[PDB]
Design an enzyme around this catalytic site. Sequence first.
Site, PDB file in Angstrom:
ATOM      1  N   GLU A 167       0.849  -1.175   0.000  1.00 57.24           N
ATOM      2  CA  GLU A 167       0.000   0.000   0.000  1.00 57.24           C
ATOM      3  C   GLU A 167       0.885   1.225   0.000  1.00 57.24           C
ATOM      4  N   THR A 200      -2.948   5.861   4.643  1.00 59.90           N
ATOM      5  CA  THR A 200      -3.099   7.204   5.196  1.00 59.90           C
ATOM      6  C   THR A 200      -4.121   8.033   4.428  1.00 59.90           C
ATOM      7  N   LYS A 213      -7.425  -1.891  11.815  1.00 57.06           N
ATOM      8  CA  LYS A 213      -6.016  -1.541  11.921  1.00 57.06           C
ATOM      9  C   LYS A 213      -5.715  -0.994  13.302  1.00 57.06           C
ATOM     10  CE  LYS A 213      -2.408   1.390   9.907  1.00 57.06           C
ATOM     11  NZ  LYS A 213      -2.059   2.332   8.812  1.00 57.06           N
TER      12      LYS A 213
END
Lengths: 203, 203, 203, 202, 204, 202, 204, 202, 204
Positions: free
Chosen positions: A39, A68, A128
């Site tokens: 990612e 992010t 997460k």
Amino acid sequence: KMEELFKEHKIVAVLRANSREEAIEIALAVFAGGVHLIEITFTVPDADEVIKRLEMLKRAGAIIGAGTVTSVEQCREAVESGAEFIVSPHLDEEISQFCKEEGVFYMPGVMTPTELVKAMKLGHTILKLFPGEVVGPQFVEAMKGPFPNVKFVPTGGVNLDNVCEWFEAGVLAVGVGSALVEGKPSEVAEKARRFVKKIRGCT
Amino acid sequence: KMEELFKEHKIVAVLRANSREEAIEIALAVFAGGVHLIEITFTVPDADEVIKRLEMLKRAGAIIGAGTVTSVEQCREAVESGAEFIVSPHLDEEISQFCKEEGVFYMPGVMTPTELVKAMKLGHTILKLFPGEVVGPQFVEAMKGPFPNVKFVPTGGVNLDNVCEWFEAGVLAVGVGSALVEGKPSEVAEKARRFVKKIRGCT
Amino acid sequence: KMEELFKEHKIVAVLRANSREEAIEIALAVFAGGVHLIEITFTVPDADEVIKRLEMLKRAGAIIGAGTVTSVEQCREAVESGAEFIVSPHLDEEISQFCKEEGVFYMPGVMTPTELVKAMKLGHTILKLFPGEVVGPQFVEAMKGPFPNVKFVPTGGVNLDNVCEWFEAGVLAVGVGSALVEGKPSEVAEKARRFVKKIRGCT
Amino acid sequence: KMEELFKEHKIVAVLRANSVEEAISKALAVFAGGVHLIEITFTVPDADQVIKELEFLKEAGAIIGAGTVTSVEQCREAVESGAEFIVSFHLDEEISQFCKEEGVFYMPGVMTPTELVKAMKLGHTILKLVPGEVVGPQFVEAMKGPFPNVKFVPTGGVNLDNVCEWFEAGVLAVGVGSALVEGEPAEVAELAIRFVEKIRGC
Amino acid sequence: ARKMEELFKEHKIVAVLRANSVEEAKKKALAVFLGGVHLIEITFTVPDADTVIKELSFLKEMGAIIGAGTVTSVEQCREAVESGAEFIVSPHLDEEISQFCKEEGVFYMPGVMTPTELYKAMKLGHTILKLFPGEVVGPQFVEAMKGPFPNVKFVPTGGVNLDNVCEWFEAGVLAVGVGSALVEGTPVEVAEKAKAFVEKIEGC
Amino acid sequence: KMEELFKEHKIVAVLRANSVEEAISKALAVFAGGVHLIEITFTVPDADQVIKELEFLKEAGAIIGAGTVTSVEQCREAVESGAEFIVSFHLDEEISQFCKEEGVFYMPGVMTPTELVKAMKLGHTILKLVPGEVVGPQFVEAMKGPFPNVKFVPTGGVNLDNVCEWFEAGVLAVGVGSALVEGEPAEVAELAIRFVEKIRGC
Amino acid sequence: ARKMEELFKEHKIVAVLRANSVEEAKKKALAVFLGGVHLIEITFTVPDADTVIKELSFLKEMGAIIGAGTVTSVEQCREAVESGAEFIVSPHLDEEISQFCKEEGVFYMPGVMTPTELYKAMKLGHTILKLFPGEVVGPQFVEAMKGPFPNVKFVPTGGVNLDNVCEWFEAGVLAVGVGSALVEGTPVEVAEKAKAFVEKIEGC
Amino acid sequence: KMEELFKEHKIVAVLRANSVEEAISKALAVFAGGVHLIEITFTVPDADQVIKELEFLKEAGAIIGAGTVTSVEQCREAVESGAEFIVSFHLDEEISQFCKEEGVFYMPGVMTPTELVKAMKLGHTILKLVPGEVVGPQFVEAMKGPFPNVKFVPTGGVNLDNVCEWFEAGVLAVGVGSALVEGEPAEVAELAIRFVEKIRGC
Amino acid sequence: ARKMEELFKEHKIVAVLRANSVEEAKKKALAVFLGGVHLIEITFTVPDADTVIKELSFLKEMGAIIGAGTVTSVEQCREAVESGAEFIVSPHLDEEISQFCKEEGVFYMPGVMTPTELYKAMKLGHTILKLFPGEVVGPQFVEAMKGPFPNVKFVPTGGVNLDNVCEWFEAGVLAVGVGSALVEGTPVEVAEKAKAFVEKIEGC
């Protein structure tokens, strides 16, 4: 299906770069090291111009997503660019609804008992855990009891000395955003091989 | 009055079991060990059958509640079953309002400064701190300053070695859902005695 | 401009007292020790009488604010009393609006990624970490990647041994609410000098 | 050095208290207010306690001496106590010998030209002029003619109202004492600030 | 002769007498005595002062206290002592006179003006000092010296009149020495002035 | 083994660069693209730096040799460099002796039947056929008649359009070189992938 | 050298001259003399003070008297005496200078401020004393010392100007020491100011 | 003679089979079709059986030799077998000595000028050009300039479509091989006839 | 004889001459010379080649360069050298001829066709090689060999005509050898062809 892909690889590149060129050189070093789940943090200058150009790796079994993502506008760009999944540092609702409609796998960030429950009620079974280095493996063990149907992917503070401890506690995958990115492409590839061997060894 | 009961006993069983039968036998072993405040995690198979069939121990001074309640439906069932108090792993609004109308003591879970303040504004003077093993006694010490009227009952991370440390920091009671429950009844009762002696000694 | 002042001094008194007389004696001991940034917890009996009285030190280069403000009513009183800035233990919504309209610097308390994001979206670039001793410098290190434009001022968990570690992680200033307030005026002034020297040494 | 400190600060506070704790509270307020030169009256009750307790201020840049030392025995005690300078109300050969040997700055008090032309012979260039309220700024100015190399630190007769006038006459520093050293620690600091700001201008 | 400290405290005023003759001095001494001033000081600026001091001894039985002032030598002091003076007052500080007076058991009050002289006087065992000229330094001097000299009492002479005689005492003064403001004019006028001084002092 | 590795991968990339850093970036892109057989031209500037630097790829299953080696001295250097195999453009008995003694796989280049029936005498079963652009796939097929026990790895004249045709003639592997090794690392990886995908089919 | 008493009495005003050079000192001394002031004191705060005193000796034949001021040592005194100084003036009372001057036969005037040394100065044989600074101790001192010290002549220096010059003379002072008020400005201005002082003094 | 036979027949058939019986059936079809010059592949299984079995054709005017001979041992066997000529792909001095001593016609294979100006030194005027499909007819014509006394019998790249073109370039005979030697005996004979008819014309 | 490299570069064309007689050879050699072709190679397929080389020596003074081609032996080479040939050219690589030519100081250019021959030629110190037949491998060979042989220059012979003579040079060719495309037909036609070749080469 991301749920299956995570189980197969158990590690995420969590790529960071200060340029388009660095992001590509790193992605190649990491992919070549046996790490398929990559990612790109959406902080990289023209990050969207990198994601759209890694299609060639998708054909090689690579999975390319974006990290992010803090707002829906960033998400929309990442999705249009061909991102396979979206990862947020926090728990939003707008991004989740957008991704749900699009059919894009979304993983929100959590840290607290209340954030966990809220996300759970939105249909998110994989969360997460960030920062992972602050709460540690004990957090996962504590949550396993009351929330046996919730899986975690801790990110940060993960290294070759403690990566197995996380898996022993019981996690889906580990996010390595330091020891699997810092250094020259030739050095990064070596680090990647160490992580893959260490994880396979312990599990 | 739960506030007085907590001060008197200073310990909560936080019982867990994999069956209806286990929960009953364990609860008796614990009560016989000098632990009067017992809550049953509402995850136990036929948990409501367990609670409503222990309506005999109340006459012996036992206090029986239900824990790990995340939904209002679970709360309603626990209350109907004869639960004296409801404990949540998180801070809800619906359960709290329901309990207030019913007149049932309710203790929400918190971890952060914001969660504490929100609960405080809802009239909650006693909060459950969870996971306790993550933040430790330092959390309580920090809150004592700015929030002198808030009492804590930490759950998890409590054993015979650090139980006095929690009380030294300044807590109302300790929740022991591991060190004093794991094993079989002939051993659990003995463990109960050690916990009572240690807490009594320090406080 | 508070942002510049915080950078220049790198330390906050975080004053606490059980009386107005103690608060004054301490404030003088601390100021004399080289600590210009002083905030008074708005829990001190007649705290407003101390704030309005010590305004005399503003001419001496002192900057006086009020901390531990949990509600708008307390904020209003502190502002009227001549407080230069307001610090909260949590992230409110009403106080920040009031302060914004008045033009008074406001710094909310945070602990988790969600709080960081919410505050960020409200235009707050400087956040207070509380309790600081629970998360430690590793929180600051983590919150540099996704949040490169957010500065922190941790309070608690700060002493003469680990003060440099906080600055190494990268903080704007440190709040000392124990070793820079406890003891006699002659002892407090001495402690204050040690803190200033150590900080200047490392940074 | 001392001479340099007088030029730099231009003001001396004189402390008098009925207790050690009181003296400390006032000394701290005075220091906080921007006054680094502190004189501790050594004729007070206890006396040999305050100088030691205020030791912590030396590290902050404070300079602490002993005031109203009238005898040799008091001088010796003040030096042993950690005083960095000795101030009297009269010229004494024994004090201006012991202090010299110990490397301690000493300044005698004067009131007349005949006392001035004696302290100078012993080697004193900085004199304490008392009572300031009796001789006035006129003494400082008039004496400048024949004795241009003598500096004064007058005590008494000086307040904010006329603090500039004393400096106009030509002094190195002013001893103001109770002019600012009175009231609560907060009040002491306030007055100390006013004196520092008032002087920094003329 | 420590009794003088108490006597000064009781009266708080001293009449300083000068004259061009014995008869004038005698009339003035009586006028102040009758007016309530029992502390009488006869100066030696008058070349018959010894006669005056001896003659006025008749007042001693009436409660008068008679001494001598303006003594500027040991020899002159000796004459004053022989004349029956109870106390000797000098315009300056004088070790030779002090030692003489000490040996003879005679109270002696030296004159001072500056802090260094006040200090020197302490070594002679003096607890009471004459401040002269009082009109030059004023009451503020007496207050200023309370710090370094907390155990020293002053008796200022000159600068004392009916307008400031009260405030002079606020400085912590033992007694005031009064000149022509008290002693001048006719015997009647002197007695009247003496009454005014005593009446105002005995009240504030 | 080598003989088996050629059979398994069927493709060899030949790298050239004006710097080491360039060579490494390209080598990594090629490996990432799925090409495990890498030949490093040894006639380039520096030369004896790239083989060592790429050591990290060997652990990943990469096999790295030295290309266009013409002399024994170069062979010695290439072997010291850690080269796994040596490839030339011509047949040389001294090279096909040194390499044998060191246990290092070597294959000579050929163009004509009289060179083929010479390398065979020296024990070579795999030959490098050059220039591919001149002889074409017809050479490979025709020679398989009388010499069915000889395999070729033709270099040059190989592109995506005709990569299958070379395999139809009957080769063990193809030398693509600059055919895919050009442009940015991203472009190199893409082309490397296309070649692998194209080969996997015939 | 009692002639100095006669000179002070007759001339009344004494000029105190200060300069940073010999040339300026000369110009001022001449202007002052021409202005009607015969008594000139040359201070020792001027470079080459001895040169100044000697070079003005030509005025002696015109009725001028040149002395030396601000002498604080015997060595400075000697240099002034060797320059032809008629008299020596000091800011304080100094026994060493006094004895030197007596042996040489040079008139000496010591400085006083208090009754104590005033007494001592007499005992040393000095009947004419300098009162300094006059800016601090006013005429009230002179009109006081007369009591205990009836035979002392004073010369106040400093604090004397054209407005209060009569007040000092009304106190019975022997002479007034004037500087800055008289000795300032150009040679023409200095002479004019000197004339103003003389005229007013003569008129009072 | 051979040299005369090449000029007379202008065509050589090359036979290959997986059995002796198959070789015989094809050989007869080819001979019947009008091709008298037969070359037997000597790298086949058995090999030393076909030449003997076809002996009966010699009486019919057939001329039978052995081709694809690469070694001396094979050459010796072929001669013993009754081969009247030996054909190779390369020049070999041991073969061009044994054959000379035994009176056996031999011709080496060539592809380049450096081989041509070597075989000529040994006395070979007729060379086999291989692979014919790689160099083409242009080689035969171009080499005729500097080497007008050298004749070729090219093999490969020869079919009915271009058989005349090869003769135009200037060859003594053409090696057709599988061009006609394929399929059933009936089909082999037909193709053999077509080649004979086509050649007799240009 | 390194100068040959420069001479080849300057002209970029070599005439390869064949004839059945000395008369034909001379006329053809002259025709190309007149057309601007200075580099002339006389083959030994001509049954009087030695005579041709000797008789044409008169052209050397006109800037003509005469050598010999198709030399297949040392003895034949010897005759070519004696006849005045400046350079010797062979269709193949020949060590015996090379050694002879080297010893005699005669420039020798061997023929090559394959990479192994190019390599062998390096051991003899050759830098210029003749590529023959050019039409078999084409310009792609010259380009292909730049890698392994970065310091080797080629002169392709055959396969060169007016439809590709310029393009041949794009491969990095030093000079081209032209056969019947240049030397054939009447003396007039030959001269015209020679001009056409030079004119088109000068362009790429």
